Each structure stands twice: as C-alpha cells, then as structure tokens.
C-alpha cells in the first residue's frame with residue numbers, strides 16, 4: 001500500500017509518441033518511418049559549444065589555472081550555489097535581455113531544471129487547494145509539475161485565434177471568476193514568455209495588462225522565460241523585469257515583490273541533461289524558502305563549474321546568442337514556407353523551437369473529435385509526430401505544434417514533402 | 426502572501442564557526458569544526474585516477490565526443506552504463522553477498538532527494554513513519570516539510586548500546602495509534618548516523634519480523650554502508666531478506682527498500698548522486714517519475730560510470746577508505762580517553778558518539794546545553810549536542826573525524842584535555 005501520489009494520482013495524446021517509438025524514421029533503413037516533430041529540443045548550435053570545449057579543456061578537468069580543484073568541487077554542497085556560476089548566470093540573463101535589466105545573484109536560486117523550479121515556486125507561493133491562473137494553450141508539462149505533489153490547482157485563462165491568442169483583460173477577469181466560483185483562492189498567474197506552444201513573445205500591452213491585473217488582485221506573477229534566448233525576430237522580447245522598470249515600479253511598489261522569473265539552460269543552450277534551472281525573485285522570503293527547497297534538487301557542482309567557465313566567456317555568449325538566433329530564424333522560415341506550399345499557415349511567431357500551425361480547414365468538423373481524427377491520419381498515414389492543440393488545452397480544435405530545431409534540414413524537407421502529398425487529397 | 430511551507434537553532438555552534446573559524450596561521454585560537462560529516466580522507470585516490478584517465482571528464486567515449494549525446498540525455502531512467510556501475514559498486518560494498526537489478530534502481534539528486542521522494546511514494550499527509558532515536562536531524566526537514574508526513578520516535582538508550590528493541594518498536598507504534606497517525610513504515614539508518622555503529626543481525630531480524638507483523642514498510646538508509654571499517658560486519662537489509670529466506674513470495678519482500686548515495690563514502694556530496702532501490706515495481710515507477718524534479722546531471726553520471734566501472738579502483742578505494750577511516754577513528758577515540766571521555770564502541774561512519782554525561786552539572790538537557798556552550802565558547806570546538814539528534818538521555822555528543830587534518834584533530838584533543846582540567 002502506497003500513497004495517493006504513487007497510485008491513483010500519478011491518455012489519447014501519446015498515440016503519436018508511441019507510434020513513433022515503434023517505427024522510428026531512418027535515413028537508411030526506415031525511410032518510411034515516423035518523423036519526430038513533437039520534441040522541443042535545440043540541436044542547432046552544438047558545434048559552437050564543442051568548439052569552445054576543445055579550445056578550453058581546463059573547465060571540464062576540475063581545474064583552475066593549472067590547478068586541480070576536484071576535491072573542492074566534490075565537497076561543494078552549499079544550497080546557495082557556486083558563486084562564480086551564479087554570477088555568470090545573472091550576466092548571461094542580462095545579456096539575453098540586451099542589458100536592459102540586471103539581476104542580483106543573491107536573489108537567484110539554482111534548481112535541477114525548470115521542472116524543479118516550476119514545482120518549488122508553487123510550493124513557495126500556494127498551499128494545497130489554492131490555485132494559479134495559466135493562459136491557454138500551455139505547456140502540458142504544467143499539469144504535472146504544478147499540481148502533482150503540491151495539491152495546487154490550475155484555472156485556465158482562455159485565449160483564441162481571433163487576436164493571435166493574446167491575453168485579454170476579459171479572459172483574466174473571467175478566469176479569476178471561475179476560480180472564485182469553485183472556491184479556489186487564486187495566488188497568482190503563471191505565464192510563459194516567450195510562449196510554448198505559441199512561439200510568440202508577449203507584447204508590452206499584454207504585460208502591462210497582466211501587471212495591472214496582478215497588482216489589482218494582489219496576487220503573484222510568475223514569468224517562465226525559459227525561451228527568452230530564442231526570440232529570433234521582432235517584436236523584441238520583453239522580460240517582465242523590464243516592464244517593472246518601464247512601469248516605474250521601484251521596491252516601493254507592493255507588486256515589485258510579487259513578480260518572479262523562472263529560467264533554464266535547457267532550451268536556449270540545449271543542455272537539458274545537465275539540469276540547470278533557476279528561480280529569480282525580489283522577495284527575500286521566497287528566495288530563502290526556495291533556497292532551502294532547492295536542497296531536494298541541487299545542481300551538480302561539476303556542472304556548475306563547467307558552465308560558469310563557459311558563460312564567463314563573453315566572446316562565446318555574445319556569439320552563441322547571435323548564431324543561435326540566425327540558425328533558428330533560418331529554420332523556422334524553412335518550416336513555415338514548406339507548410340504554406342501545402343496550403344497550411346502558422347500563427348506568426350518570432351521565438352521558440354516550434355510553430356503553432358493552423359490546420360482548422362483540414363478538420364472534417366470543428367470538433368476535438370475531428371482534430372483527433374486529423375491527428376491520427378497524420379500519425380498513421382503521413383508518418384509525422386506532431387502535437388494536437390487540445391494537448392496544450394487549446395480552446396479551439398485544429399491547431400498543432402510542430403518543432404523544427406532538432407531535425408536535419410533534409411528530414412524537415414522530407415516531412416514537408418509527405419505533408420504536401422497527403423494534403424493533395 | 427506566501428504558502429505555509431514558505432513560512433531549530435542548534436546552529437549556534439555553526440554560526441560561531443563561520444564568524445570565528447580556526448586557522449593554522451592567523452587564528453590558531455579559532456573554533457575547530459567537528460560537526461560536519463564529510464569524508465576528505467581519500468581524495469588523492471580519485472585525483473590520481475582522474476589524472477591517469479582524462480577521457481571520462483572530457484565528454485569522450487573511446488576517442489570520440491559524446492558531448493551532444495550527453496547534453497541531450499534527460500531520460501528519467503538514468504544513463505544505463507552508470508546504473509550498471511552503481512549496482513555493481515553496491516554489490517561490491519556488500520561483499521557481493523547480494524545483487525541489485527539496475528531497473529529497480531532510480532537515481533536522485535542526493536539522498537536528501539531520495540529521502541523525500543520515498544516518503545512521497547509511501548505515505549500521504551497525516552500518516553507517519555517510525556524512526557529510531559537518536560537520528561539524523563536532517564530527517565526532520567527531508568521527510569516532513571513538503572510531505573505533510575509525521576515522524577514518531579522509537580526510543581533507544583545507552584543501557585544496550587542504543588540498539589533497537591521489540592518493546593521500543595511496539596511502544597512507538599502505540600504512540601502513533603494514540604495520536605491517530607497511520608504508520609506506513611519504519612525508517613532506519615544502517616550504518617547509523619550519529620551512532621557510528623552497524624546494525625546487528627538481531628536488530629535486523631526483529632525489524633523484519635515487526636514490519637512483517639504490522640504489514641508496513643522498511644526503509645534502510647544505507648548511505649554509510651561503505652564506511653564500515655571494523656567488525657561486526659555491516660549487514661545490508663537485502664542480505665537479511667536472503668538469510669531469512671524471503672523470496673518474492675513473501676509479502677514483506679516488496680516492502681523493503683534501500684536508500685544510498687555517493688556523498689558519504691566517496692565524498693562527492695557536491696555531485697548530487699543519490700539512489701532509491703525497491704523490489705516493488707509500483708514504487709520504482711512512481712519514484713522514477715518523481716525523480717524528474719531532481720535528476721542527476723548527465724555530465725556527472727558519465728564521469729562516475731567511468732570511475733565506478735574501474736574495478737581496480739573501486740576495490741582499492743574501499744580498502745584504502747576503511748584503512749584511513751579506522752586509523753582516524755582510533756586517533757579520536759584515544760585522544761578522547763586521554764581526557765577521561767569514552768565513546769559508544771563504533772565500527773562505521775565518519776564520527777563518534779561520545780559519552781560526556783559525567784561532565785553534566787545535571788542530568789538534564791539544560792545541563793547538556795550548558796556543557797555544549799562551554800565547549801563552543803571556551804574550548805572552541807564545534808560538536809553536536811545529542812538532543813539535536815533527539816537523543817532521549819542528555820550528555821551524548823557526536824564528533825566527526827574524517828574532515829580534519831591529524832594535526833588539527835590533535836589540537837582539538839589537547840584543548841579538550843586542558844579544559845577537562
């Protein structure tokens with residue numbers, strides 16, 4: 001006999017995933033296999049990092065100027081993190097934001113990925129039975145990260161295509177009211193900026209409306225800016241930290257302490273296996289609580305050392321960002337154009353590793369049953385693994401998310417060809 | 426406007442140290458740290474190996490680069506190679522008397538993480554776990570903070586070397602019922618922190634039978650299994666199952682779990698390598714999904730799988746580690762008796778459970794706090810008061826010996842002797 005969490009509290013949407021695993025596509029021996037376009041991973045700039053590693057072997061050698069510091073690292077288990085790394089991190093975060101804002105390293109707490117940061121924040125801001133508002137459509141992983149062990153609930157703030165899925169004052173108010181009706185105390189709004197799965201940076205207008213709503217309701221604002229480094233085209237990416245500055249919110253504003261940021265190196269630098277997440281808050285109480293909670297998911301000191309060396313190289317960071325935006329824009333343009341050669345268009349995006357594509361016109365009907373229908377035809381007949389919009393809780397059937405940053409151009413082309421032949425009927 | 430969770434000061438000794446740390450050169454009268462359970466005894470063996478085997482830490486596997494491959498590795502089942510090296514090392518520690526299935530092993534970011542995840546998997550909020558007293562003070566945070574689970578003590582006393590008793594178990598179980606807490610299991614540290622003793626076969630059988638009798642779980646935190654430097658032999662709970670003839674047909678066979686970590690034996694706490702081992706498929710699956718909130722860095726998993734795959738190194742590290750640890754413990758134990766102070770006879774760990782009851786102005790905890798302060802402020806040593814570990818009798822202290830140069834240990838022993846005067 002185990003706990004509720006381990007048993008009856010531990011779907012149709014993994015159909016493409018399992019179908020893919022069973023028949024993975026292969027350039028040579030399985031050219032008709034399923035192509036993976038449902039994995040948000042960035043494999044575009046590993047050459048830049050491999051190159052740097054080759055010219056800078058000391059980092060990964062437990063060294064510092066011909067000096068071994070192995071023993072020192074092996075012993076480092078301070079929940080405040082390696083100072084050098086926290087400094088390099090805060091600088092990198094600033095550089096991503098074009099140095100428009102600066103971060104205090106002491107308000108930054110490292111976690112084993114954003115997955116960890118996501119949950120820890122919830123543990124810090126809400127008790128079981130309370131709720132957090134999240135704009136729809138959203139990262140399906142939130143349904144596990146934010147609620148599994150926290151007992152916290154998610155109330156959706158619905159967005160529709162009528163306005164490019166932007167956040168609305170009416171949607172916010174309505175979501176807040178839906179929570180009250182259910183007798184759930186709203187503790188905050190969690191936003192993904194840039195957005196997964198939309199692929200769009202949040203507008204200043206949306207940000208101001210959020211800040212004012214959060215200020216109005218007296219709740220928190222968590223900005224998951226894990227994709228902040230993948231904004232490859234205008235409009236410019238606006239970090240919530242910038243908006244505070246621009247709305248003239250100094251530490252005298254009450255809201256100034258209710259705005260937090262979540263970040264990670266998994267999506268921009270493509271290092272998900274290294275488990276580097278971070279929490280940033282202006283509230284000392286949250287930093288302290290989150291710092292103690294990070295003990296359940298500390299970042300390997302070996303990794304913290306490697307990355308502090310890497311991220312301390314301003315020549316590399318500056319160049320990685322520029323090269324990463326270049327390669328990502330090129331790639332998105334490719335997918336977007338190949339998609340329209342099939343008559344399919346996408347939500348106009350400027351960030352992320354995926355496109356939110358519009359396939360409503362292919363729906364035999366404007367129902368989610370019709371969307372599941374289309375999705376299956378794509379899985380079984382076109383042999384592509386893509387994500388159905390309903391997976392992300394989209395309110396209108398027919399939208400899909402397709403990734404482009406972890407596929408060789410040749411494969412992307414193949415997928416686009418298969419799509420075109422299929423649409424042909 | 427935060428959660429209840431976002432809103433135990435024995436850290437006194439800790440603060441004073443940080444403020445006034447002892448130093449060989451500019452602060453010879455500073456406070457000496459003897460309250461930190463860390464093993465700094467064999468880093469030379471590891472540094473040596475790293476030097477002769479540079480490929481491991483180079484994101485290289487047979488002259489080729491696997492950086493991208495590792496950078497992308499985020500499977501919550503862990504790197505297969507590492508899980509194999511780990512299970513072999515665990516077997517080797519237990520003198521190959523038991524073998525572990527790598528698929529029943531789930532990696533976590535330290536034992537701290539493994540501790541909590543196990544609680545999340547075995548008990549719901551408001552339920553309880555029994556823990557023998559005295560115990561690792563960290564349990565009070567790890568097992569209850571975010572889990573809402575409660576700890577009910579199974580008290581042990583010096584009358585029998587702080588061993589577990591059938592009467593203490595029964596009494597603890599009854600204290601839980603009285604409080605209307607549902608007991609879900611017993612958590613044991615074998616070898617023990619802070620006792621420094623390996624659990625006896627007798628204690629183990631009595632635990633197995635009690636747990637079997639009550640129909641609850643048995644979690645054996647064997648994080649110190651590799652530091653058992655003197656007999657009696659260390660007996661892993663996995664061995665006792667084998668010895669009590671418990672195959673997978675026993676119900677209890679699926680209610681026995683182990684927690685392990687590389688932080689105390691190999692001295693790698695910064696790398697965050699913990700592990701959960703269970704025979705129950707349901708726990709492994711749930712724990713595997715929970716590990717996503719605290720996965721082990723793929724860069725680290727790779728380095729250690731290379732290291733632990735070297736049977737020449739593992740075999741030699743264990744032997745050398747037991748050697749250096751026994752030498753060190755003997756030093757502290759003798760220097761302590763030259764002061765008239767004795768310790769609980771131990772054979773494992775990185776610390777000694779020392780008896781200083783005779784120094785108490787009173788057989789009270791206020792007296793123990795009295796003594797402890799005199800030791801902190803006058804003798805300038807940071808040691809842990811037994812009440813921190815929930816010891817039921819005042820006067821016991823835990824002092825570490827594995828992270829102090831012999832010269833410093835000597836200094837500490839000298840200061841103690843002068844004070845005892």
Ligand SMILES: *Cc1c(COP(=O)(O)O)cnc(C)c1O
Nearest residue numbers: 113114115139196264266272277
């Ligand atoms: C990919 C992703 C995560 C997980 O990040 P890790 O650092 O791999 O744990 C969390 N949130 C969002 C929105 C993501 O896209």
Ligand SMILES: *Cc1c(COP(=O)(O)O)cnc(C)c1O
Nearest residue numbers: 535536537561618686688694699
């Ligand atoms: C030191 C210790 C821990 C913490 O180990 P980590 O691997 O650093 O998380 C857990 N339990 C006991 C009994 C310990 O002594």
